Every structure is written in C-alpha cells, then in structure tokens.
C-alpha cells in the first residue's frame, strides 16, 4: 500500500526533527512547524522510492 | 588564546538521594583477600601443579570420556527384555 509507505517515511522525518532538536539541547517541541517540514520532505522521498519500485516491477512484468 | 567559551557556567555532578548509614564495617583483611581471589588470573603462572591439573582436566579426562562415549555407542538396548537374550548389540 502507498499510504502506509508515506506515513512511515513521514515518521522517519519526525524522528529526524526530534533527534536534531535533542542534539542542540532544545526541548522536544521547539519549532513545531519544523516537524511539518521534515515530514513532508521525507514523505516525498517515500513517494520517489515507491514510484521507482512500481516502475521496476512493471519492467519485470513485461519480460514474459 | 584557545579556551572553551565563557558561556558555560558548568557545575558539579551529584548522583542525588539519601546518604544511607553504614550497615557494614568493612574488614580490610577480608576485602584484600577477596580482591586477591577474584582477580586471581592476572597473577596466575604455570608451575608443575598447574600443569598437572591442566593435563588432567583438559586433556586426559575429555579423552577418557571420549573413549567411553564413542566406543559404547549403540551397544545397549534395554527396552523390553527376556532371559538369555542378548543384552548388547555388538
């Protein structure tokens, strides 16, 4: 499914923003729009990798 | 001219909590005895006694169990039994 593959990469993005706050000795929610930025960015990476895998599967289907 | 910054104010570390009073008087002789026994391996050396024990329990005793275990392998079949029947296989 495409949707869980977006939500998981967005969760990886929330983890990036969280851990980057915690290295800088900030609290958890410091700049809470930055979670939206990282979620959209890593979710877009999930879009890209999802579509590349789709097209690769279709190329394998056409070889029969 | 290279010093960590003036903006640190770093302090001392406590572990926090309650000073429990001493329920045990430590004995210096027993303490140094036990510290000698646990870290015994840092001062162990090979002598004739050490070599005799290492020859028996590492070499001769596994070889004796090896002889007994690999020779007497499928001999005994004590499942039912009768009188006069074969007790072994070989």
């Amino acid at each position: 499914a495409l949707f869980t593959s977006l939500v998981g990469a967005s969760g990886l993005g929330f983890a990036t923003k969280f851990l980057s706050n915690k290295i800088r000795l900030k609290p958890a929610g410091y700049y809470p729009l930055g979670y939206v930025f990282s979620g959209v960015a890593w979710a877009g990476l999930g879009l890209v990798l999802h579509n590349v895998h789709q097209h690769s599967l279709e190329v394998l289907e056409k070889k029969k | 001219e290279l010093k960590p910054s003036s903006a640190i104010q770093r302090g001392p570390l406590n572990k926090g909590g309650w000073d429990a009073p001493h329920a045990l008087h430590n004995d210096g002789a027993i303490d140094r005895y036990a510290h000698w026994r646990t870290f015994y391996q840092e001062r162990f050396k090979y002598t004739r006694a050490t070599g005799k024990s290492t020859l028996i329990f590492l070499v001769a005793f596994p070889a004796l169990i090896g002889y007994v275990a690999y020779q007497s392998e499928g001999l005994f079949e004590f499942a039912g039994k009768r009188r006069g029947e074969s007790v072994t296989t070989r």
């Binding site: 499914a1 869980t4 | 572990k15 329920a23 430590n26 027993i30």
Partner: protein, 486 residues
C-alpha cells in the same frame, strides 16, 4: 488508518505522562503488564490440535515496507508461533514486569534510561521467540547485546567495565560463527525459513561442517566447557534486572535455538556427532558444578548453578528421544523461575542492605530475618531438585532421556543430584545458621515487594512441580517434531 491512530494516540499519552509525571516506571509497568493480557488472549485462541503455525505476519516486505503484507512474493521478515515457541513467550511475559519491578526503590539516578533499557531488552527477547527466518532470528539474537553492554557498563556494581566488555565480546565471538553457518545455508537453500527446512536434505559432508558453526555458537550462549569463562563474571558485576533477565531468559534462548535451528535440518549430522555433545555436557556438569565449592563471592555461586542446570538440559534435547525434549523444556521453564528468585536473594535483597557480596561476612541470618531464611531454604531446596518443584521433573526426565541414548554417560551424569546439592546446601547452611554476625547491623525485614516477587516465583515452580502436565497441551507436537529414530 485505525492502527495508525492508535499509535498516534498512545505516543501522545506517553508524551503527557512524561510531561506531568517524572518517571515512566508506572507507564512501563502498565505496558509490560498489558502484554500479559494480550499474550494470554493469544493463548486462548491457540489451536492445540494443529502442528501448524497459527499467527503469522511478515514485516518489511517489498510491496509494503511499513507494515503488514499479503502478496504472492515474500522477502520480508516472517514471524509466528507454535507450542514450543509459545511456552517460552509465556515464560517471558510473566517475568518482565518482575524485573521492571525488581529495581523499583533502587535506581535514583537516570531512572528513565534504566527502565527503558530493561523493557527494551525484554521486548527484543519476546520477538526472538516470534521470529521465523534464519536472519530474523539472528537480527534479534544480537539486538540485545548493545543494550546489554550499556546496561552492564553504566549501572554495573564495580569493575563493570570488564563485565560489559565480556558480555559483548564472548557472545559476539561465538555469534559470528553462527552468522557463517547461516550464510552457508542461505546460499545453498536460498531460503531463510523455519517452515520448509524439514523438506531440504543436505549432503552429509555439507551437513557435517555447518553443524559446527551452530554448535560452537550455542556453546557460548549456554556456556559449555571451553566457554563459561564469561558467565560468572558477567553476573557478578551486573545490576539486578540485567542479571534476572540474563539468567532467566538469555540462557534458555539457546535451549530454544538448538531445537529450532539445529535438530530439524541437521538430522543426519547429529547422530554421528551427539557423543561429542555428551562429552561436553558431562564435563560441564562434572567440572563447573565442582568449581562452585571454592567461591568467595555470593552471586558467582548462583551463576555456576545456572551453568550446571543448563548443562543438564542440553543432554535432554540432544537425546533424540521423546522424554528428554519435554524434560529440557520443563527445565527451561522452571529454572527461569527458580533462578531469578535466587538473584533477588543474593544481589537483590542482600546487596541493597549491605552493598558487599563476599560470603565471609554473612552468617546468622535467621535471628533477625526469619522470613528471609525461609526464602533462603525453600528456594535453595527448589534449586537442588527436591520433587514437587518442577526442577526435579526436568532433571529427572532429562537424565532419563540422556540415559536412553547412551547409558554409561547417563549413569555417570546422574551424580549431578549430589553435586547440585553440595554447594547449594553449603551456601544455605552458612547463611542460615550461626550467631548473627559481628559486621552486620540489623536492617529491615524483607519488604512487601520483595515478597510479592518471591511468592510468584515460588508458586510458579510449585504448580509445575505438582502438575507438569499443565503445558503438555502445547508441547505434544514438538515432542515428536524432532525425533529421527526412523
């Protein structure tokens, strides 16, 4: 969308209990306690009539990396149970709130670190027993070791540096050879799987030399004779939780892994080579239960006790007979009860009161702690293998199964009842008797939580000791799934 919403709610509830409350001892207890309510309801819906694996799920499939998958092509990580796999989960989940409880009034410095590490190395050994590939069994066979390293290094007693290095080094050093033998049968069979490998035979020259890589890998984990270097000196400097979860859970894992990995695809490589397993198991029972006698430290004795019982257990597995398999399982479920109770006695209660673990200070425990000297005696006499305790049912059936396969090695190995009585009763009558010691101010009686743990770990031995059949409903397929006597 629904199961995502459950997670988005539960992480928020966790966040707010982090915010208002300071510790998450209460929410870790609540979560690890709800794990029981979950796994018992999984036990209710368990069909016992089928050898089959009931509850199956793949994680990390190609078509769905973040979650479940239903495809005709599977390269993820399989998970499931039957029987065997389920008794050890039920061993686990009723013990992890007791180690999570076990350091309640103790920690005082970075408690949120400690209970996170303990709960995490308990969840990883849940999913050990759920796993079904050779790699998904192996990627959690050492996800423990990081958190075990840091749980021993910080929070270890004194000289915890060396113990933390040993729990990484020895386990890793024996574990890489397991990785070799997994790589070889993943490039020969092209399947990592616990379902199909009954079907696949191998050449005896191939099957011979991949059994080595798994056997000297479980020689480290259940510490057999050229190993058990590390076992007492990882115990003796561990904290309280990481000693209970070590000796009750990490040791029985290789008892589970000699069943799950070795016996059903190494069927013909073992019958040539069981009488090396009998050599090694006997001279761990003869040797390591004889070095217990001369021990100045008090936690090291219960460590070598764990070695001696795990050396009895793997000559019940490797019997290729039907009583020994069930006997080793009931050893693994009963030693995992009686042994962490003993670690609560040695470094649990007595090290909290007097902070030094030398034996020579400790006598006359009866005159000021009567209702601890009772827990000394009934729990020791449970470790020796008095009947009606569940340790004797296992010791009896495993010595009987090892008597079938080779009777001379069983006759020699029967002396373990004596050798396990010697050191345990020598410790018990040094601690219990005599005039109350000079060095020792009188401290508190054993408190409500350190009785609440103990009576659970005592009733759970006595129920198995009065009826070992309460878990025959699970195991009666796995008594048969591993016999190759044609």
């Amino acid at each position: 969308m629904f199961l995502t919403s459950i997670l988005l709610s539960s992480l928020y509830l966790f966040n707010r209990i982090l915010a208002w409350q300071g510790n998450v001892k209460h929410f870790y207890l609540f979560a690890s306690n709800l794990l029981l309510l979950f796994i018992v309801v999984l036990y209710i819906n368990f069909n016992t009539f089928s050898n089959s694996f009931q509850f199956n799920f793949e994680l990390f499939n190609s078509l769905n990396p973040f979650g479940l998958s239903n495809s005709d092509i599977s390269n993820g990580l399989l998970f499931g149970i039957d029987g065997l796999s389920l008794t050890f989960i039920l061993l686990t989940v009723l013990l992890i709130p007791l180690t999570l409880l076990g350091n309640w009034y103790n920690i005082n410095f970075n408690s949120n670190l400690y209970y996170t590490l303990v709960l995490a190395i308990g969840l990883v050994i849940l999913l050990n027993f759920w796993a079904l590939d050779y790699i998904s069994f192996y990627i959690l066979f050492e996800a423990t070791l990081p958190l075990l390293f840091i749980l021993i290094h910080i929070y270890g007693s004194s000289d915890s540096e060396r113990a933390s290095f040993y729990v990484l080094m020895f386990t890793l050093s024996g574990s890489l050879f397991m990785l070799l033998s997994i790589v070889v049968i993943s490039i020969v069979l092209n399947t990592t799987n616990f379902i199909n490998h009954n079907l696949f035979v191998l050449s005896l020259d191939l099957q011979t030399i991949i059994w080595l890589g798994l056997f000297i890998a479980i020689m480290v984990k259940t510490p057999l004779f050229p190993i058990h270097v590390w076992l007492p000196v990882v115990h003796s400097e561990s904290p309280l939780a990481g000693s209970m979860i070590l000796a009750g859970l990490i040791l029985k894992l290789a008892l589970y892994a000699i069943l799950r990995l070795l016996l059903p695809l190494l069927c013909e490589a073992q019958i040539l080579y069981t009488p090396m397993i009998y050599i090694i198991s006997l001279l761990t029972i003869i040797l390591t239960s004889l070095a217990t006698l001369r021990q100045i430290d008090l936690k090291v004795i219960i460590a070598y006790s764990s070695i001696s019982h795990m050396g009895i257990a793997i000559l019940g597995v490797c019997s290729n007979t039907s009583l020994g398999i069930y006997g080793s399982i009931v050893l693994g479920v009963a030693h995992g009860f009686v042994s962490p109770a003993l670690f609560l006695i040695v470094g649990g209660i007595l090290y909290d009161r007097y902070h030094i673990r030398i034996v020579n200070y400790y006598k006359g425990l009866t005159t000021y702690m009567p209702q601890l000297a009772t827990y000394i005696i009934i729990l020791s006499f449970a470790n020796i293998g008095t009947p009606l305790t569940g340790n004797f049912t296992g010791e009896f059936l495993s010595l009987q199964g090892g008597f079938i396969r080779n009777p001379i090695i069983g006759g020699i190995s029967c002396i373990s009842v004596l050798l396990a009585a010697i050191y345990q009763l020598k410790l018990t009558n040094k601690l219990t008797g005599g005039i109350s010691s000079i060095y020792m101010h009188r401290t508190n009686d054993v408190t409500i939580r350190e009785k609440f743990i103990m009576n659970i770990l005592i009733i759970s031995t006595l129920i198995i000791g009065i009826c070992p059949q309460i878990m025959y409903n699970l195991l009666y397929w796995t008594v048969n799934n591993y016999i190759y006597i044609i």
